[PDB]
Symmetry: C5
Subunit: 376 residues, 5 copies
């Protein structure tokens, strides 16, 4: 993930211009190799046409170049790229929205599962660990970085996400499909045991716990679905064919013909086809947006930081359910204890942001005394 | 389903280029027959024009060819294809999202329905079997592969999805519509019996069970709706007419006229209309995306693997509710039992993915001492 | 509703081509009258130009024809049609999604409302009948077919949807607005009475019943809203003006001028403007998609089968709550009672659909022994 | 709101054509003034060019006219209008979806709050009145028609929406922001009092009441947000600039030059630029769609009928909670009491809508005896 | 936020025209600097071409100018701008929808947490303060204005949002990530303590409180996600490159060549390229829409008023939970106590908005006596 949110907080002069001076996650980094290949092919064709071809061969090549330049169209490519990239971006954000966060679940586990003794600690930690284990089980299934961190279940054991007993239990239950769903059954059964054992005081709290857990399960299932059901290969091939056919045609139709022939539009022979290179940057970068985002769990610069998410979730959830259980700051009257209309101060840098309340769009409507009188 | 997610994890050089070397689920496989027909017709027209037609007939055909090539437009076809294919893809993903998964339901059934005896096993298995039976009842209604697996209800009995008693009960209830809804009524009544019989301890657990079951019912109803309410036939015919009229026009307007006439744009007579073939690939593949996805429960390469889903759901749900009921791994203190800030290790291949936390876009804003002072 | 889902299960050769041989719900049926009018006007103009007009008049008409043919543009029409038809289709599917189904409600009513005696039967049947009565009350408000079936409330009484006592009660409550909401208040009060009377055992079951009922109410309210708040008339008039202005212009700009004048592009005088007719089919059918779908509760071929839905809902709901109440198939051990890994068989026609499980996109990643070692 | 749903029930001959004969909410009513201004300016320019300008001045004006007519483009205007109007229409429907309806809430209040005495009546009426008061408080904040009906809180008191005691309480709580949220706090506290006082029998019923109330609060907050957060002014100005620049250019580039000069495309001097007027109608009406819908709570013909909604909600909710409380029609066996397969009759006008059930797209698949045999 | 809702209530003559006379949040304010730079560069190029260049150099520059003007295309730029700006606007509204409001939570806290003594006041105030503290913690993480108001946690203490004890507790829990989640764990634990202490009477009320709190947590997490996961930098760079390449090309291709050469389209040498400036305004303002909205928590005119939201939320929530707890207006019979059909009056200015109820689109259908007869 490349974050530039702070750089575009305000619409300043050349706001998006400055973003052109970035390398990581940039268009240049993504398409420099393709551009080099295209440039080499273009100039190889130029040299062949200029030197190797004879007079009649050169005339044939010139006729071909005019014919090609006539057959270059940018409407269909723009249409297909726009629609396909819109789909890819929508799926990319949907895949982010299905990354599980244990925050709701950990708050419920910390509040509801009672006991400051070693049994209560163990129970809360085990429940939140089951949540985290399901999450990383799915993430290592779908993310190459997480997989490289945990290439086997024994790596999960060594990293503390799973205990040896849990690993043995998983081995016992082995089915010929992904076992990422098992920690949810474990969580449900352990929560039921906690309720029956008196650690959870009321069944409605148990229902809340299991509802949050099931929300996490639905998110992980959506992650699995996105990993499994790719965008149809035919659509991807169609957009790829459109782009690459356009630029294969450009390789010939954008050659600088010999000026002496004085063909229409070829009067001046510049060596560098600047507009064709700009079109390459535009269209191939538009395609590279999809190429990077189509699988957001790879290792691109703009792909999600799954390993950081795993680490943060583990730390935060364990802290929330273990150290923060029934550990509250002292409850004392606040600064506005007897202030009916609290007005927190503003700093010098923020005083300009003090605003009057918006009362509605009808507030300033003006009516006469006659207009405002109720009729019978 | 053709999965190429691992191949597009990163935006590598020619990432989408390599996908052009795939056959299953490919554009080539989908439109090779249509392309062969188009090619044969094009060259039949070419031979007729070149040999059969007389001088005046050839001049008439040339005038017709110019007139046709003038009347070929790619804006409306791109518009209609983009919108129609977007609709088809949206419905395709919506239909995936309505495939029922018993995972939430099976976790609840495993946790809440109590008893390790043969009655508890039977009750849990029967409930989850009712869920699975409703699912396959709808799937065999909407999926041709599942139907070919279970062409009759007796096949469901032979496959273990339904018992003979359940088959007799279904026959007793026969109405002149699809009976996929019956297992939900059965599930509700059996859950109520379990609660009244003491197997379910609290009515809120019963409400959770029935909420998950009703979610599954809503998904199955959406599957039925998508199977029943097709995209309006008029829209499909409109897009088909657009595409096929375009290429019928191309059959004449893209013929290579005799060079001796030296018509504008026909100076060089290549035999193969390469750009017209590229346009065929592009547009007809764009249409074939919709043709494949319009009914995602057929037998195309990219259609959903419904039979695998049925098998996996049966296995996983039965295991979850029967063997995993109150069968938990030993609960022991974890590796970070007294570690306030757990830091799971990284491998050599994944050390590069260790990241500092993103603290927010306002973290690095700089303010002077005067700026940060509160004003009265 | 015209269902062709089975015909497009697979992307076969000419899959959408075969759909051009359909009449019901087809483009031909929808626009043949408009096409006949357009054809008659076109040829009337042709005959007037060819016979009535004098030499100078013919020259003026030819200049007008060139001027018109120059002023024909297909970009704005495609834009507006695409956006407007997308909106219409979105609203069409939203209106389908708000058709109420009593399946969740009937399952809850069958399970929760207890008693096999005549009072329990009457209570369950009355509750589900209130649901069905609200549904048909709204449907006859919004659907012309349902209205033609039930043109008055006395027709509802004669058809069994409402009792004479309910009709009298509705008459007593008459307000100067649609009374489709009354059965929901009746349902709520009757459910409360059932709970207070001991027929519903716990208030959480009552909350479930009323939640499902309120979901149905929200759907019916959305149906009312779609019936009431039409797509803004100005937008519809704008799209209509675009289409009809385009083809009014075509009536003159697409006339076949006299060849002897040898105008550019008019060298050959074919009598039938085939491309203009194809454009008519395309654009007017695109508009007819919206014309058919703008009100999906009319009597078009592709409009919803509301009467069938009403009948099916009544039959299914009454059967579910009355005959299926606490009437379960015998609960016996299933075929996989002691089979840890059930494998339901495949038929000969379906053996090809047996698939190996997809384990995730990271499954086949390869790492060396050094790469997989945890670092300190 | 202009409702034409009944007029477009079926896709009849010239279905959208007849809608061109409507005045209220029409394109003509919306843009006749702008069209008159444009027409006057166009013909003023025509007269100036024809009479005032000298020969050299006329030649300069002709060169300018050709230059302008060359610089008129309809692609960007169509793009921006389509996207902007799509956004406006989406927000318009979202704003409708956030209009609060007390139907779910009034059903719950009627059912759950017990007591046929004057205290129960007062409690139910007060709760539903708090709901209605919150609704109109927000509506008069955002709707000009409702504001004109209730230009002050004393008008709310005189109209019966608020009591003098409630007005005094609101005055006591006055904060420098919109107070539309207060009735929700009142409702919550009154419901809690009713539960503690025994009028609400179980806390789960209280939770249902407050959930429905909070749904209404969320809708009212969304109404406030839409009133407050306008579509960014820059976007609106951009689309306005596009449209008006297009037609300012047309004012000169669409002038009829003197035929004697025989400029290309100006051979015939018709006085009325019919196509330019059609383009004006199309594009300016497309913009007027957004102009009307951008604030749907104004007083346009197609703006929402907020006053009717307020009146209907008050009447219906008071009737539902007061007169309909525990007032049910007599519960008697229905017409299909012992009819396992009820078949409500059809009228002569509706017999054509009797349909056979759709059994699924796989129903008619045919398989041989060999194909249907299970394999081991 | 620039609100112009009241100005566009009705579609009046020149409704959007008047919005062109606005400065704050306007296109002019956003792009005047870029326009000045573009104008200066354009006229520098003009002067160089007119004075510095020699005859042959001027001819070369003229050929270059024709070549450039030929290579200027507005289809791809419009496509990419439309799609990208649509994405930006969608994310902008989504980010507004995730701004937390404590209204549902404060109503629940006021109702459910009992006790008019100093302990009950303290408990309610502390809970709602935890909600507000979580909100501002996230807002100061994502909003530059809020950060400038609270550049440190000690500023939060000085402003009354946090107590010194809470600050010490936060310091104790410090992890190397954003700690905005801590107040939710605090809230959950304090609510559990209140329930165990008898201040919350039933666990279902506790479940309601925690559900509302968790909704707020989900909103704050979405705010964090939008702050962290920027729109992919490659997409932004692509759109920026498209726009700036277009106008860099215009800098040369839109120069006014010397009339004496009488080049096609350059007959008249006006000094000001008015259409190019209009295109600049259009396209660069379209881009500036995204530039302003890409981060809606900056300090642009149209960015959200986060500081006002924070202040209003604090004031309203404290008032709701402290002063409004069990403080209700006197409950007395309303004005329509015995009025079965209440009709609140209309004013003279609003009498025109009195409407008859819409009874449904099928109300006015006419049928004969034969048509309405049920058939057997
Ligand atoms: C006719 C319709 C278009 C068809 C496209 C034809 C191009 C060839 C497609 C087949 C790709 C072979 C992939 C492969 O097996 O290779 C693997 C290699 C590692 O990765 C690579 O080969 C990297 C190759 C990336 C392509 C070159 C960069 C594209 C530049 C634009 C086009 C101008 C150059 C022709
Ligand atoms: C004027 C507007 C366009 C109208 C379209 C005219 C084409 C004919 C449509 C009628 C299809 C008959 C379907 C049929 O009953 O047949 C069934 C047969 C098995 O399946 C087939 O016939 C496969 C036929 C597939 C069509 C040929 C491939 C399309 C290639 C592009 C067009 C170039 C060739 C003309
Ligand atoms: C200048 C901008 C365009 C304006 C459109 C002018 C056309 C006339 C619009 C007024 C329609 C009168 C509706 C009516 O009261 O009539 C009712 C009659 C039954 O239903 C009918 O009249 C059916 C009439 C359907 C129209 C003819 C079919 C359209 C074919 C394309 C256009 C070529 C023919 C001119
Ligand atoms: Ca990636
Ligand atoms: Ca398919
Ligand atoms: Ca219809
Ligand atoms: Ca309006
Ligand atoms: Ca901003
Ligand atoms: Cl609940």
């Amino acid at each position: 993930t490349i974050t530039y949110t702070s750089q575009v907080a305000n619409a300043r002069l050349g706001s998006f211009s400055r973003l052109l001076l970035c390398w990581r996650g940039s268009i240049y980094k993504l398409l420099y190799g393709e551009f080099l290949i295209f440039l080499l092919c273009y100039y190889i064709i130029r040299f062949i046409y200029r030197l190797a071809l004879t007079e009649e061969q050169q005339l044939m090549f010139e006729k071909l170049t005019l014919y090609c330049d006539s057959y270059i169209q940018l409407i269909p490519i723009s249409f297909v790229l726009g629609f396909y990239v819109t789909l890819v971006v929508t799926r990319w954000w949907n895949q982010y929205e299905n990354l599980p966060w244990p925050d709701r679940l950990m708050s419920l586990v910390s509040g509801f599962v009672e006991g400051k003794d070693e049994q209560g600690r163990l129970l809360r930690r085990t429940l939140i660990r089951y949540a985290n284990l399901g999450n990383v089980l799915i993430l290592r299934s779908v993310s190459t970085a997480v997989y490289k961190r945990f290439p086997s279940a024994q790596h999960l054991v060594q990293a503390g996400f799973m205990t040896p007993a849990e690993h043995k239990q998983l081995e016992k239950l082995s089915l010929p499909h992904n076992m990422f769903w098992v920690p949810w059954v474990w969580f449900a059964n352990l929560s039921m045991k906690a309720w029956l054992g008196g650690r959870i005081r009321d069944p409605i709290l148990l229902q809340s716990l299991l509802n949050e857990m099931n929300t996490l399960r639905t998110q992980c299932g959506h992650l699995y679905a996105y990993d499994w059901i790719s965008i149809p290969l035919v659509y991807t091939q169609v957009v790829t064919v459109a782009v690459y056919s356009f630029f294969l045609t450009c390789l010939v139709g954008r050659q600088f013909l010999n000026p002496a022939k004085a063909y229409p539009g070829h009067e001046l022979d510049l060596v560098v086809p600047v507009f064709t290179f700009l079109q390459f940057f535009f269209y191939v970068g538009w395609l590279k947006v999809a190429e990077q985002l189509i699988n957001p769990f790879g290792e691109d610069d703009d792909d999600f930081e799954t390993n950081w998410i795993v680490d943060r979730n583990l730390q935060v959830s364990l802290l929330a359910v273990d150290e923060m259980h029934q550990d509250l700051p002292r409850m004392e009257p606040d600064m506005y204890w007897n202030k009916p209309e609290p007005q927190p101060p503003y700093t010098a840098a923020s005083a300009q942001f003090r605003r009057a309340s918006f009362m509605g769009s009808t507030f300033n409507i003006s009516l006469n005394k006659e207009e405002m009188e109720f009729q019978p």
